[model samples]
Target: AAQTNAPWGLARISSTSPGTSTYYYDESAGQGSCVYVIDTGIEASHPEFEGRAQMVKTYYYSSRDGNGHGTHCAGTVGSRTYGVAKKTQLFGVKVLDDNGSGQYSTIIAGMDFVASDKNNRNCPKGVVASLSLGGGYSSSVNSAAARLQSSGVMVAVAAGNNNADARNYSPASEPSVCTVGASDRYDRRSSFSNYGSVLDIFGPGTDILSTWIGGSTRSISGTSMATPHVAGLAAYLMTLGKTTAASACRYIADTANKGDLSNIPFGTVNLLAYNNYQA
Candidate 1:
């Protein structure tokens, strides 16, 4: 009942003057930067991306988003109509299968592939990768994120949908990456979203309409959905300059809007505003 707002509820809050609202949906601005979706995979042929989607590696051999989850997240992360960073380069890594299952080693391979990608001679800023799946935290995944950040990469992950404490989850609890929770367009915390000091930021996640596989659009809900909004914003921030994941994480959290919805201490902020950078 809280998600009827579509993209506007989340759209009006980013990339603008602090007090003044902005909704710049420029399709050509994100051309130089890239955001990688580490999920089921991607529909690289989707017109929504305008030929920027890259299939880096698929553990299962097929890089297409058969489960639709990864494609939806990818759509929000950089689609021209639904994405926050319309022109940013989008990449896909298949770590999960259609049943939403992934082997631990396969997932690790996807992470390693992204970290070692040196073909970005054209891309100046660091790359931002978003992961929507979660299990218990693995020491390897957490450490990989740390190493990638050290080399100029940003990772954004879902805090989880358990509504428990984010501190209890694996990648959510993982250090070095930005953990995201879900909020409605009204900035109300989604009942299913996790909370705690471990959560780094919030975004519009309820009934989000984004690109779907098979050439169409659809709506879905989850912290899985919420995480990509932050990823898109992360890509947005990176394009402004050479904002690293660490700096972007701090800037986003420090400048977030304080909302009364979350059980956590920090309030949410409108991601749409670029006021501080502008000023």
Candidate 2:
């Protein structure tokens, strides 16, 4: 496998990537796939990416990574060394600013851009969009996410770090998007993870390691980190002949480990998540 920075998410995957492939997906994973991180831009030239990440939008700085959040999320999606689908290309659509905050319009701009025909070519087989940011519900954002999904693009969003129902949030509660919650290394729910029926699945989000800004690295914890795992999973599954967004989501729901979280929603029993891929 090509060298990666320190992708801890790989450990959660069931098989050796770019090499062993008996039952799990690997770096040679996706076919002409691309993952779009609709957050801060990425360090497009980061060595871990092998120069595969592209910045489709610019914000306060000429450098793609004005804020590290986007780069971190992008690395989880498709950085050659650190990504889930290591072969898949990554795109940065800047939404948030250096201070790690942005308005609804900012997020909307990035989302709108990716919905175009241009983004339709970013991936040959398919596209997966990752959003690690969220706020209160917005009809416009919900509509955009649903529209993208209807057009064959898979959207993965954070269920939020707020210890409340995700239904109060925008893209997290938005229809048709995969709302990812945070889980610890032991497959238990992270302490700060939001929960609700809107949450689609849980992923490793505690002390997760990935590429940071300036081509550096660090560990972060949040539902934001977890979102990319599902996004990358969606991209990899697309390459494995689960070509549609619905199939990938359905597969996760159908195959996820049940009763794994220590904090399953009150009314919900046997919450589910991707513990290991059985392909």
RMSD of each: 4.4, 3.8
Question: What is the clash tally of candidate 2?
Answer: 0
The residue-by-residue lDDT of candidate 1 on 146-215, one tens digit each, is 6666666678889899978777776788867888888765556778988777777776678888888898
List runs of model 2 lying over 4 Å from the truth: 1-8, 15-24, 59-63, 117-122, 268-279
Residue 209, candidate 2: Cα error in Å is 0.4
Error of 1 at 159 (Å): 0.2
Model 1, global lDDT: 0.72
The candidate that achieves the highest lDDT relative to the unseen native structure = 2
Scored by CA lDDT, what does every candidate get? 0.72, 0.75
Query: How many clashing pairs per prediction, in order?
Result: 12, 0
Which segments of candidate 1 are over 4 A away from where they belong? 1-6, 15-22, 25-28, 118-121, 260-279
What's the TM-score of every candidate structure? 0.86, 0.88
**Candidate 1: deviation at residue 59, Å?**
0.5
